[PDB]
Paper text:
Here, we investigate the capability of a deep neural network model to automate design of sequences onto protein backbones, having learned directly from crystal structure data and without any human-specified priors. Of these 8 designs, 4 are cooperatively folded proteins, as indicated by circular dichroism (CD) wavelength scans and by the presence of clear two-state transitions in thermal melt curves.
We successfully crystallized 2 model designs, F2C (1.46 Å resolution) and [name] (1.9 Å resolution), and the crystal structures validate that the sequences indeed fold into the [name]-barrel structure in agreement with the designed backbone. [name] adopts the full [name]-barrel fold, but for two of four monomers in the asymmetric unit of [name], one of the β-α loops shifts to interact with an adjacent monomer in the crystal. However, we note that [name] primarily elutes as a monomer in size exclusion chromatography, and the interactions observed in the crystal structure resemble crystal packing, rather than a stable dimer interface. For F2C, the model uses an isoleucine to wedge between the long and short helices and forming a Tyr-Glu-Ser polar network that extends to coordinate the loop from the beta-sheet to the short helix; for [name], the model has a different solution, designing phenylalanine and valine residues (F10, V14) to pack the long helix against the shorter one near the top of the barrel. Particularly interesting are the Tyr-backbone contact and the His-Glu-backbone polar network for F2C and [name], respectively, that help coordinate the helices across symmetric subunits at the base of the structure; these are the only hydrogen bonding solutions designed at this position among all previous structure-confirmed sequences for this scaffold.
Residue numbers in the entry: 1 to 183
Write the structure that this text describes.
Protein backbone atom coordinates (compact mmCIF):
# COMPACT_ATOMS: atom_id res chain seq x y z
CA UNK A 1 0.00 0.00 0.00
CA UNK A 2 2.83 2.51 0.95
CA UNK A 3 6.08 2.37 -1.07
CA UNK A 4 9.02 3.80 1.00
CA UNK A 5 12.13 5.03 -0.92
CA UNK A 6 15.37 4.58 1.12
CA UNK A 7 17.67 6.83 -0.99
CA UNK A 8 21.44 6.34 -1.70
CA UNK A 9 21.64 10.11 -2.43
CA UNK A 10 19.37 13.10 -3.33
CA UNK A 11 19.73 12.49 -7.14
CA UNK A 12 19.14 8.67 -7.05
CA UNK A 13 16.25 9.01 -4.49
CA UNK A 14 14.44 11.55 -6.74
CA UNK A 15 14.95 9.20 -9.77
CA UNK A 16 13.19 6.33 -7.84
CA UNK A 17 10.31 8.66 -6.67
CA UNK A 18 9.84 9.93 -10.30
CA UNK A 19 9.78 6.28 -11.62
CA UNK A 20 7.10 5.30 -8.99
CA UNK A 21 5.07 8.44 -9.94
CA UNK A 22 5.46 7.34 -13.65
CA UNK A 23 4.37 3.73 -12.73
CA UNK A 24 1.19 5.24 -11.14
CA UNK A 25 2.21 4.38 -7.53
CA UNK A 26 -0.65 5.32 -5.16
CA UNK A 27 1.23 6.33 -1.90
CA UNK A 28 5.01 7.11 -2.12
CA UNK A 29 7.16 7.84 0.98
CA UNK A 30 10.77 9.11 1.28
CA UNK A 31 13.24 8.82 4.24
CA UNK A 32 15.76 11.60 5.01
CA UNK A 33 17.33 13.31 8.08
CA UNK A 34 16.67 16.75 6.37
CA UNK A 35 13.46 18.87 5.89
CA UNK A 36 15.19 20.62 2.91
CA UNK A 37 15.76 17.23 1.13
CA UNK A 38 12.18 16.04 1.95
CA UNK A 39 10.74 19.19 0.26
CA UNK A 40 12.44 18.09 -3.05
CA UNK A 41 10.93 14.56 -2.55
CA UNK A 42 7.35 15.99 -2.12
CA UNK A 43 7.86 17.84 -5.49
CA UNK A 44 8.87 14.57 -7.32
CA UNK A 45 5.62 12.87 -6.06
CA UNK A 46 6.21 11.66 -2.43
CA UNK A 47 2.93 11.78 -0.35
CA UNK A 48 4.64 10.89 3.00
CA UNK A 49 7.80 12.67 4.28
CA UNK A 50 9.70 10.49 6.81
CA UNK A 51 12.19 12.25 9.15
CA UNK A 52 14.99 9.82 10.19
CA UNK A 53 16.87 12.03 12.70
CA UNK A 54 20.61 12.09 13.71
CA UNK A 55 19.48 13.00 17.30
CA UNK A 56 16.06 13.91 18.85
CA UNK A 57 16.78 17.71 19.27
CA UNK A 58 17.72 17.93 15.53
CA UNK A 59 14.82 15.60 14.48
CA UNK A 60 12.05 17.77 16.11
CA UNK A 61 13.34 20.96 14.30
CA UNK A 62 13.02 19.14 10.89
CA UNK A 63 9.36 18.24 11.82
CA UNK A 64 8.57 21.93 12.77
CA UNK A 65 10.22 23.06 9.46
CA UNK A 66 8.01 20.60 7.45
CA UNK A 67 4.96 21.73 9.55
CA UNK A 68 5.67 25.42 8.61
CA UNK A 69 6.20 24.31 4.94
CA UNK A 70 2.69 22.71 4.99
CA UNK A 71 3.80 19.09 4.27
CA UNK A 72 0.71 16.85 3.64
CA UNK A 73 1.83 13.88 5.84
CA UNK A 74 4.95 13.87 8.12
CA UNK A 75 6.34 10.65 9.72
CA UNK A 76 9.14 10.30 12.37
CA UNK A 77 11.36 7.19 12.98
CA UNK A 78 12.52 6.44 16.58
CA UNK A 79 13.46 3.52 18.93
CA UNK A 80 11.67 5.35 21.82
CA UNK A 81 7.93 5.95 22.58
CA UNK A 82 8.97 9.10 24.56
CA UNK A 83 10.70 10.73 21.49
CA UNK A 84 7.68 9.82 19.25
CA UNK A 85 5.19 11.46 21.74
CA UNK A 86 7.20 14.76 21.34
CA UNK A 87 7.56 14.18 17.53
CA UNK A 88 3.68 14.02 17.41
CA UNK A 89 3.51 17.38 19.33
CA UNK A 90 5.55 19.20 16.57
CA UNK A 91 3.02 17.68 14.08
CA UNK A 92 4.25 14.17 13.02
CA UNK A 93 1.11 12.40 11.63
CA UNK A 94 2.76 8.87 11.70
CA UNK A 95 4.92 7.62 14.66
CA UNK A 96 7.33 4.83 13.43
CA UNK A 97 8.90 2.40 15.95
CA UNK A 98 12.30 1.17 14.65
CA UNK A 99 13.32 -1.14 17.53
CA UNK A 100 16.76 -2.52 18.62
CA UNK A 101 14.95 -5.60 20.09
CA UNK A 102 11.56 -7.28 19.22
CA UNK A 103 10.52 -7.59 22.94
CA UNK A 104 11.41 -3.86 23.49
CA UNK A 105 9.74 -2.77 20.19
CA UNK A 106 6.33 -4.30 21.14
CA UNK A 107 6.48 -2.49 24.57
CA UNK A 108 7.17 0.82 22.72
CA UNK A 109 3.99 0.05 20.63
CA UNK A 110 1.89 -0.73 23.80
CA UNK A 111 3.16 2.54 25.45
CA UNK A 112 2.14 4.66 22.35
CA UNK A 113 -1.25 2.79 22.28
CA UNK A 114 -1.85 3.77 25.99
CA UNK A 115 -0.95 7.47 25.24
CA UNK A 116 -3.44 7.35 22.27
CA UNK A 117 -0.84 8.25 19.57
CA UNK A 118 -2.42 9.34 16.20
CA UNK A 119 -0.96 6.67 13.79
CA UNK A 120 1.53 3.96 14.94
CA UNK A 121 3.87 2.15 12.52
CA UNK A 122 6.38 -0.70 13.16
CA UNK A 123 9.44 -1.68 11.04
CA UNK A 124 10.54 -5.38 10.90
CA UNK A 125 12.03 -7.92 8.42
CA UNK A 126 9.47 -10.50 9.78
CA UNK A 127 5.71 -10.86 8.96
CA UNK A 128 5.46 -12.83 12.30
CA UNK A 129 6.93 -9.90 14.34
CA UNK A 130 4.64 -7.44 12.45
CA UNK A 131 1.54 -9.62 13.29
CA UNK A 132 2.43 -9.19 17.04
CA UNK A 133 3.15 -5.39 16.61
CA UNK A 134 -0.36 -5.14 15.00
CA UNK A 135 -1.94 -7.02 17.96
CA UNK A 136 -0.23 -4.47 20.32
CA UNK A 137 -1.77 -1.56 18.31
CA UNK A 138 0.43 -0.78 15.22
CA UNK A 139 -1.79 0.46 12.28
CA UNK A 140 1.01 0.44 9.61
CA UNK A 141 3.18 -2.70 9.18
CA UNK A 142 6.48 -1.78 7.46
CA UNK A 143 8.45 -4.67 5.82
CA UNK A 144 12.21 -3.88 5.87
CA UNK A 145 13.76 -6.99 4.24
CA UNK A 146 17.29 -8.53 4.24
CA UNK A 147 16.64 -9.51 0.53
CA UNK A 148 13.97 -8.91 -2.23
CA UNK A 149 12.45 -12.41 -2.89
CA UNK A 150 12.17 -12.84 0.98
CA UNK A 151 10.72 -9.30 1.47
CA UNK A 152 7.89 -9.87 -1.09
CA UNK A 153 6.76 -13.19 0.57
CA UNK A 154 6.48 -11.33 3.97
CA UNK A 155 4.15 -8.80 2.20
CA UNK A 156 2.02 -11.69 0.73
CA UNK A 157 1.78 -13.21 4.28
CA UNK A 158 0.68 -9.83 5.83
CA UNK A 159 -1.93 -9.55 2.97
CA UNK A 160 -3.31 -13.09 3.76
CA UNK A 161 -3.32 -12.17 7.54
CA UNK A 162 -5.37 -8.99 6.80
CA UNK A 163 -3.28 -5.90 7.62
CA UNK A 164 -4.87 -2.39 7.76
CA UNK A 165 -1.86 -0.86 5.87
CA UNK A 166 1.31 -2.62 4.57
CA UNK A 167 4.46 -0.54 3.70
CA UNK A 168 7.80 -1.72 2.15
CA UNK A 169 11.27 -0.02 2.32
CA UNK A 170 13.57 -0.33 -0.75
CA UNK A 171 16.34 1.65 -2.55
CA UNK A 172 14.79 0.42 -5.84
CA UNK A 173 11.51 1.46 -7.60
CA UNK A 174 11.71 -1.99 -9.39
CA UNK A 175 11.50 -3.78 -5.96
CA UNK A 176 8.73 -1.39 -4.73
CA UNK A 177 6.62 -2.08 -7.92
CA UNK A 178 6.59 -5.86 -7.09
CA UNK A 179 5.84 -5.15 -3.35
CA UNK A 180 2.77 -3.07 -4.50
CA UNK A 181 1.77 -6.06 -6.75
CA UNK A 182 2.06 -8.26 -3.58
CA UNK A 183 -0.19 -5.89 -1.49
Amino acid sequence: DILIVNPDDFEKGVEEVKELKRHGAKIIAYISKSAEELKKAEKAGADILIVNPDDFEKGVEEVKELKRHGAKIIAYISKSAEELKKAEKAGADILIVNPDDFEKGVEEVKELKRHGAKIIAYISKSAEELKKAEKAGADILIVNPDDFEKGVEEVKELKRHGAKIIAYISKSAEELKKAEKAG
